């Protein structure tokens, strides 16, 4: 594993998920970007 994940929760400050997905505010799980 290297990045978090769509599935893994993470913060918009500290986003710790893989390209193409973002951390948005709106909520904790990773979303996608497209």
Same mark, same amino acid.
């Given at each position: 594993? !290297? /990045?978090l994940g @769509?599935?893994?929760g993470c913060d918009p400050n500290n986003?710790? /998920?893989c390209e193409g997905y973002? $951390?948005?505010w709106k909520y904790? @799980? $990773?979303?996608? !970007?497209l």
């Open positions: 594993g !290297d /990045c @769509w599935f893994s986003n710790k /998920c973002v $951390c948005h904790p @799980w $990773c979303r996608y !970007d």
